Design a protein around this ligand. Structure first.
Ligand code: RH2
Ligand code: RH2
Length: 426
C-alpha cells in the first residue's frame, strides 16, 4: 500500500485535489520518514512538503490525515536543528498546540511529542513554544485525580515534553513558566513509573542548574526528601539525574545544603562513592566537594557519617576525573574545617594519596593539592606539630614530589612549592 514510495510519487499525491489521495501520500511520507536506515528528511523538506503537512494539521474533518501529517512532522522535528527550524518556519507550533485538545488520544499524544522535540531544540524555540501558550493545555492533560488512570505511554510522553520545557540555558526558562510547571512536576516525581521518575528527575536537575534563586524555588516545593529517596533507587536511569539534581542543590546556600543533609542524603554516599558506574562516582564526589565547602557543622556531619574514609578511598584509586573532584573535596574540607577536623582527616590516611597525585600531569589539581597541604600545615602550626607532619610527608615520598615542582612549568606552583620547602623543610 504505502510501503517504499518515492518522494516524487508522494509529491504527486499530496498535490492532487483529492483528500483520500492526499491521506494516502501523507501516510507514505510518514513511513519513509520513519525508516531506521537514514530517513530522507532533507529531500522531503526540499520537495516543499512541510507547509502542506502543516495545513493538514488543521483538517478537523479528517482525523487520519491529521495524525499522519503530525507523525511525519514529528519525524522531521526530531532531526537536526535546521530540520526542526524548517518545521517551526512552516507554522507548526500553534497548529500542534491546537491539536493538544484533540478528542483523539493518538493525535494529542503526537502533538505532545512534536512540541517536546521543538522545545527541546534550544532556548529560543523553548521560549517560543511557551509564548504560543503550550503550557496550560499540556498541564490540562494531566489534570486527573490519579495519574495511574492515564495510559503509560501517554504519561511518559507528557513528562518528557514537560522536561524539555525546563531544559536549556542562556537564558534559563522564564520564571513565570517554571512556577507554572513545578507543581505538576512535583506530582510526577512521586509517580510509580521508572521512566516518568527519570524524566521528572531530569526536569528537576535542569531547574536547579543555576543561581540560588532558581534552586530555592525548587527547594521550597519540598522535593529534596523525594530526590534523596530516588537517589537510593536501584535503577541507574533514576539515580543519575537524582544525583545531578542533588549536586546542583548543594552548590547553593548553606541553608539549601542543610536540607539535603536533613533529608538523609549522606547515608547513600558510601555506595555512591564506590559505585561501579564511573559518572556516578564522579558526580557523587563532586557533590561531596560542595558539601565540604560548607559550614564547620556540615563538615562535621560528613565526619559523623563515616564519609571521610570513602573520600580517602576515591583519592587513592578512581578514574582521574573522580580523583580531581576528591582533591577539591579535600581542599575545601581543609580550608573550612576545625583543627580537630583536619587532624581526623590526617588520621584517616589522607597524606599519602594526596602526595601520590602530585605526580599528575595537570596543573590545576597540583595547585589544589598544594593548597590543601598548606591548609593542613596551618592546622599543625596551631598545634606545634609541623615537624611530625613534615616527617609523614617525607616518609611516604612526598618531599621528592614537592621539590620536583619548584622546577615546574607554571609560576604559581613554583612559588607555592618553594614556600612549602623553605618554610617546613629544613
Ligand atoms: N555550598 C557551597 C558552594 C561553594 C562554592 C565555592 N566553594 C569552593 C568550591 C566548591 C566546589 C568546587 C569545585 C571546583 C572544581 C571542581 N570541583 C569542585 S570549588 C566558594 N568558595 O564560593
Ligand atoms: N573553569 C570554569 C569556571 C570555574 C570552574 C569551577 N569548576 C568547574 C568544574 C569542573 C568539574 C566539575 C564537575 C564535575 C562533574 C560533574 N559536574 C561538574 S565542576 C566552577 N565553579 O564551576
Amino acid at each position: 500500500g504505502t510501503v517504499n514510495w518515492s518522494v516524487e510519487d508522494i509529491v504527486k499525491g499530496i498535490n492532487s485535489n483529492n483528500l483520500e489521495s492526499q491521506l494516502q501520500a501523507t501516510q507514505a511520507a510518514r513511513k519513509l520518514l520513519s525508516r531506521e536506515k537514514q530517513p530522507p528528511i532533507d529531500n522531503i523538506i526540499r520537495a516543499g512538503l512541510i507547509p502542506k503537512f502543516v495545513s493538514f494539521l488543521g483538517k478537523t474533518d479528517c482525523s487520519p490525515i491529521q495524525f499522519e501529517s503530525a507523525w511525519a512532522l514529528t519525524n522531521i522535528a526530531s532531526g537536526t536543528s535546521e530540520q526542526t527550524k524548517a518545521v517551526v518556519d512552516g507554522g507548526a507550533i500553534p497548529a500542534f498546540i491546537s491539536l493538544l485538545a484533540s478528542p483523539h488520544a493518538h493525535i494529542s499524544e503526537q502533538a505532545v511529542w512534536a512540541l517536546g522535540n521543538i522545545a527541546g531544540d534550544g532556548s529560543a524555540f523553548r521560549d517560543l513554544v511557551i509564548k504560543h501558550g503550550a503550557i496550560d493545555p499540556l498541564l490540562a492533560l494531566l489534570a486527573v485525580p490519579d495519574l495511574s488512570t492515564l495510559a503509560c505511554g501517554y504519561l511518559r510522553n507528557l513528562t518528557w515534553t514537560l522536561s524539555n520545557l525546563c531544559r536549556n540555558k542562556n537564558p534559563a526558562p522564564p520564571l513565570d513558566a517554571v512556577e507554572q510547571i513545578l507543581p505538576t512536576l512535583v506530582r510526577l516525581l512521586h509517580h510509580n513509573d521508572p521512566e516518568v521518575l527519570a524524566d521528572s528527575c531530569w526536569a528537576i536537575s535542569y531547574l536547579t542548574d543555576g543561581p540560588n534563586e532558581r534552586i530555592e524555588m525548587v527547594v521550597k516545593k519540598g522535593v529534596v526528601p523525594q530526590l534523596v529517596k530516588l537517589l537510593g533507587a536501584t535503577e541507574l536511569p533514576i539515580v543519575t539525574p537524582a544525583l545531578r539534581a542533588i549536586g546542583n542543590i548543594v552548590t547553593g546556600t548553606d541553608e539549601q545544603t542543610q536540607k539535603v543533609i536533613d533529608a538523609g542524603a549522606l547515608a547513600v554516599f558510601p555506595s555512591l562513592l564506590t559505585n561501579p558506574k564511573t559518572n556516578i562516582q564522579k558526580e557523587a564526589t563532586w557533590t561531596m566537594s560542595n558539601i565540604t565547602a560548607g559550614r564547620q557543622d556540615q563538615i562535621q556531619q560528613v565526619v559523623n557519617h563515616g564519609l571521610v574514609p570513602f573520600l580517602v578511598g576515591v583519592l587513592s584509586k578512581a578514574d582521574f576525573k573522580t580523583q580531581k573532584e576528591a582533591a577539591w573535596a579535600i581542599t575545601n574540607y581543609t580550608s573550612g574545617g576545625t583543627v580537630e577536623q583536619i587532624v581526623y582527616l590526617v588520621h584517616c590516611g589522607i597524606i599519602e594519596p594526596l602526595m601520590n597525585l602530585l605526580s599528575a600531569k595537570d596543573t590545576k589539581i597540583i595547585q589544589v593539592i598544594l593548597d590543601a597541604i598548606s591548609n593542613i600545615f596551618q592546622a599543625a602550626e596551631k598545634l606545634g606539630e609541623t615537624e611530625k607532619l613534615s616527617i609523614m610527608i617525607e616518609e611516604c615520598g612526598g618531599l621528592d614530589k614537592i621539590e620536583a615542582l619548584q622546577r615546574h612549568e607554571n609560576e604559581s606552583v613554583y612559588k607555592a612549592s618553594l614556600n612549602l620547602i623553605e618554610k617546613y623543610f629544613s
